[PDB]
């Protein structure tokens, strides 16, 4: 699901850039955001367990 | 967070979350008396003040108290269960006497508090017995350390303080005193006796009379612990 989300996120960022194409820089930023939110969810679950 | 595994709430053993519930409840019993005390450290004087509740006119008011002398120089307040308080006071007196017998000089406050807290730690490790439900505060003059104010609790914590409160109203009094110590110095004269009385009066909202509190003092000029009488207490009460 993470690797499915990174695709849609990167496409949408490229769209905000106002282009027809996604870029490697855009993909990097999307994957950073998606993985950051994934780790945030994991640590939130851990805190809830705490 | 609040799991239970077996007898973790019946004997002093760890809970799944690394918690000793019996020690926690014991702390909860310190408030079963319904009393509070405060201690304040001055520049050349250390003071301990406490409530004194005469439930009715059949008790002998001279006997009900919570101030005791461990030595001639070190005096303490006891708060919480009364029988446990007496037991701990007896153990303290014996320990101080033994210190002077063995080592040839009177016992430092901090070291007495350490011995007593160690006793309580043994009480909170072994499971045959239960932790005592009382807390101490000690005061006296050190030779080269100035006035000392120290307290101990059921779990075994013996932190030394600049101004302290123990009892039902621990948090309100501690807040007030923290603010004062923030202001200039947390009282810097023998009229630190007024700050403690004010703290108790504000927290409990009482407007004390002469016959509803008992004080003890230690001065650098007069190291011997002294238990303020009713006339002196009334004088200080009028002062404010």
């Amino acid at each position: 699901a993470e690797v499915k989300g990174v695709c849609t996120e990167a496409g949408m960022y490229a769209l905000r850039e106002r282009r027809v194409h996604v870029t490697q820089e855009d993909f990097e930023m999307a994957v950073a955001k998606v993985m950051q939110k994934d780790s945030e969810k994991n640590m939130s679950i851990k805190k809830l367990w705490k | 967070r609040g799991s239970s595994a077996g007898f973790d709430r019946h004997i002093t053993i760890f809970s799944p979350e690394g918690r000793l519930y019996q020690v926690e409840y014991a702390f909860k019993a310190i408030n079963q008396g319904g009393l509070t005390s405060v201690a304040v450290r001055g520049k050349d004087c250390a003071v301990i003040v406490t409530q004194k509740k005469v439930p009715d006119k059949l008790l002998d008011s001279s006997t009900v108290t919570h101030l005791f002398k461990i030595t001639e120089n070190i005096g303490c307040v006891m708060t919480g269960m009364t029988a446990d308080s007496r037991s701990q006071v007896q153990r303290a007196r014996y320990e101080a006497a033994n210190w002077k017998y063995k080592y040839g000089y009177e016992i430092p406050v901090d070291m007495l508090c350490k011995r007593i807290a160690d006793i309580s730690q043994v009480y909170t490790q072994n499971a045959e017995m239960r932790p005592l439900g009382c807390c101490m505060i000690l005061i006296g003059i050190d030779e080269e350390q100035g006035p000392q104010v120290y307290k101990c609790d059921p779990a075994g914590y013996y932190c030394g303080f600049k101004a302290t409160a123990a009892g039902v109203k621990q948090t309100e009094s501690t807040s007030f005193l923290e603010k004062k110590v923030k202001k200039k110095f947390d009282w810097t004269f023998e009229q630190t006796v007024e700050t403690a009385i004010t703290c108790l009066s504000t927290v409990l909202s009482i407007d004390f009379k002469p016959s509803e509190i008992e004080v003890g003092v230690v001065t650098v000029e007069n190291p011997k612990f002294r238990i303020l009488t009713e006339a002196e207490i009334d004088a200080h009460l009028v002062a404010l």
């Binding site: - | 709430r9 019946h10 004997i11 019996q22 409840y25 014991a26 702390f27 909860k28 019993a29 310190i30 408030n31 079963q32 009715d56 006119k57 059949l58 008790l59 002998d60 001279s62 006997t63 009900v64 269960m81 009364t82 029988a83 446990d84 007496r86 037991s87 007896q90 499971a127 045959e128 017995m129 239960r130 439900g133």
Partner: protein, 239 residues
């Protein structure tokens, strides 16, 4: 399951077994102690379970030393064991420090002995409350009390037993400060009769005692004639 041993606190910071033991002490009859200028006066209501017992069966006043008295209420086995322990403390004190035990010190030692029975699982709290009272030229008249929790507090007047509240409301009126044992005795009988309930219990015979300047500092059973006159005055007051 928080009330099976004295080695466990309730979640709200209570030792229940002690509370139950102290509850037991409110099923036994009423005892009274009043301190005055001259000395102390104990008076106990002794219920007669059956007509077949002797007079003086299960006396509920004891002598722990030649100057000290002891009133009890609750389990009698615990009362007698604690009487033994107080006697032992007094004898040891005399043999060690060479003089009659000051009463406060005896109260402290006995109370510590009781309190030590309210910490462990291996033993159970005593089911008895008791009051010590002595008199000496130096220390004057004293009257103390120790409850199952092991708390010792001095008293100007107290009542340990079933009808403790009624007596307490009654003892508060004497102004005992400014009388002597001789009138305190009549008062004590008066109260013990005012508190007694004739609907529930059948009948009783008083046990009275004192220690004061009239005994040279000896605790001893109040003499027969004075006891009878006191009983008669109490009877009249209960018109």
């Amino acid at each position: 399951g928080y009330d099976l041993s004295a080695s466990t606190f309730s979640p709200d910071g209570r030792v229940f077994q002690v509370e139950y033991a102290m509850k037991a002490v409110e099923n036994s009859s009423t005892a009274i102690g009043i301190r005055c200028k001259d000395g102390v006066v104990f008076g106990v209501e002794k219920l007669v379970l059956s007509k077949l017992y002797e007079e003086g069966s299960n006396k509920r006043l004891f002598n722990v030393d030649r100057h000290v008295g002891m009133a009890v209420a609750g389990l009698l086995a615990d009362a007698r064991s604690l009487a033994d322990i107080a006697r032992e403390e007094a004898s040891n004190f005399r043999s060690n420090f060479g003089y009659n035990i000051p009463l406060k010190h005896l109260a402290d030692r006995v109370a510590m002995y009781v309190h030590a029975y309210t910490l462990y699982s291996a033993v159970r709290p005593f089911g008895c409350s008791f009051m010590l009272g002595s008199y000496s030229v130096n220390d004057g008249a004293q009257l103390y009390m120790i409850d199952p929790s092991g708390v010792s507090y001095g008293y100007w007047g107290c009542a340990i037993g079933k009808a403790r509240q009624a007596a307490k409301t009654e003892i508060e009126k004497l102004q005992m400060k400014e009388m002597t044992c001789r009138d305190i005795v009549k008062e004590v009988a008066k109260i013990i009769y005012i508190v007694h309930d004739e609907v529930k219990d059948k009948a009783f015979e008083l046990e009275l005692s004192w220690v004061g300047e009239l005994t040279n500092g000896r605790h001893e059973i109040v003499p027969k004639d004075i006891r009878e006159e006191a009983e008669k005055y109490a009877k009249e007051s209960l018109k």
